[PDB]
From Swiss-Prot:
The chain holds residues 250 to 566 of 566 of the full protein. Belongs to the peptidase M4 family. Ca(2+) 4 binds at Y194, T195, K198, D201. Coiled coil: none annotated. Extracellular zinc metalloprotease. This is Bacillolysin. It is an enzyme of class 3 (hydrolase). The active site is at E144, H232 (proton donor). One of its GO terms (molecular function) is metalloendopeptidase activity. Keywords: Calcium, Hydrolase, Metal-binding, Metalloprotease, Protease, Secreted, Signal, Zinc.
């Protein structure tokens, strides 16, 4: 739409009030955010299995209805993700060229999913038991949007070690996005949307992958063919290494000095963008992470040493 930049208000999935960037055109306001380097659009599929649906239009610039909630969050959190990338690394959208961010909410009926489809963000509303509206969790959004960035860089193949690395990368960043918005931060993934009645859980944990049965050491990796070679479980190995590099700890007899989330982020960003390839394995991830740290802090630096220490802890050389 073409119009005038407005600022509205609405309530998200968890019931919190949020500030919205919309556009006034004719008699209505549209969930269209013209404020950033990339345009952000939010759509309504009206509980159908169609894409992208209808661009979202409101009569008064107030998004306080129960039906509004998923759209308010989808809208807000994508602008927050753009922000994280723009401020931290000077990245202009998913492709470094201002590609627009599109999201469809109310997709299907009681659909327990949300993913980047290679072109836009897709959100279902959940069954209200296993999940709630999928747009209410910032780390899951940051995770999927980061998949858009890998595709525009390393392009890690979704199978075996390189696929797990892909998954790991996306968790690291979604976590980073959550800390970014001071969105009650932690190292678990999906706790704001998962099993709305049970407090305590998440889909997986970076601090202790074994809580959910994921491996936390190379010697314990899944070796078969299921899940494109165990893509979603083996990522726990890289997740654990990332956690120890940011916060420190003792793991399998190896003591790691943490360097903080900001350097963890710069090291992985640099690694994924200049060093990783489509088929980077965990051993090459170590070497590339090591080179990134050397470039960033110096070859004989304490950072580089932490990098080495962190992989050692998880059995990767
Ligand atoms: Ca309204
Ligand atoms: Ca949290
Ligand atoms: Ca989290
Ligand atoms: Ca829960
Ligand atoms: Zn993923």
């Amino acid at each position: 739409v073409t119009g005038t930049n407005k600022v509205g208000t609405g309530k998200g999935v968890l019931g919190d009030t949020k500030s919205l960037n919309t556009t006034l055109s004719g008699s209505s306001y549209y969930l269209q955010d013209n404020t950033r380097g990339a345009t952000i659009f939010t759509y309504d599929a009206k509980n159908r299995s169609t894409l992208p649906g209808t661009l979202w239009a409101d009569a008064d610039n107030v998004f306080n209805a129960a039906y509004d909630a998923a759209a308010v969050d989808a809208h807000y959190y994508a602008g927050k993700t753009y922000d994280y990338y723009k401020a931290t690394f000077n990245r202009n959208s998913i492709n470094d060229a201002g590609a627009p961010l599109k999201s469809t909410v109310h997709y299907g009926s009681n659909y327990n999913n949300a993913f980047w489809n290679g072109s836009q963000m897709v959100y279902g509303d959940g069954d209200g038991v296993t999940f709630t509206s999928l747009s209410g969790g910032i780390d899951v959004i940051g995770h999927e949007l980061t998949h858009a960035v890998t595709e525009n860089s390393s392009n890690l193949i979704y199978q075996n070690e390189s696929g797990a690395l892909n998954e790991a990368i996306s968790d690291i960043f979604g976590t980073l996005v959550e800390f970014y918005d001071n969105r009650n931060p932690d190292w678990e993934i999906g706790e704001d949307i998962y099993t709305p009645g049970k407090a305590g859980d998440a889909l997986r944990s970076m601090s202790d992958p074994t809580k959910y049965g994921d491996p936390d050491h190379y010697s314990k990796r899944y070796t078969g063919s299921s899940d494109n070679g165990g893509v979603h479980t083996n990522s726990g190995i890289i997740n654990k290494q990332a956690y120890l590099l940011a916060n420190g700890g003792t793991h399998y007899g190896v003591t790691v000095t943490g360097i903080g989330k900001d350097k963890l982020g710069a090291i992985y960003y640099r690694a994924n963008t200049q060093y990783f390839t489509q088929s980077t394995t965990f051993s090459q991830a170590r070497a590339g992470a090591v080179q990134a740290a050397a470039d960033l802090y110096g070859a004989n630096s304490a950072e580089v040493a932490a990098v080495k220490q962190s992989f050692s802890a998880v059995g990767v050389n």
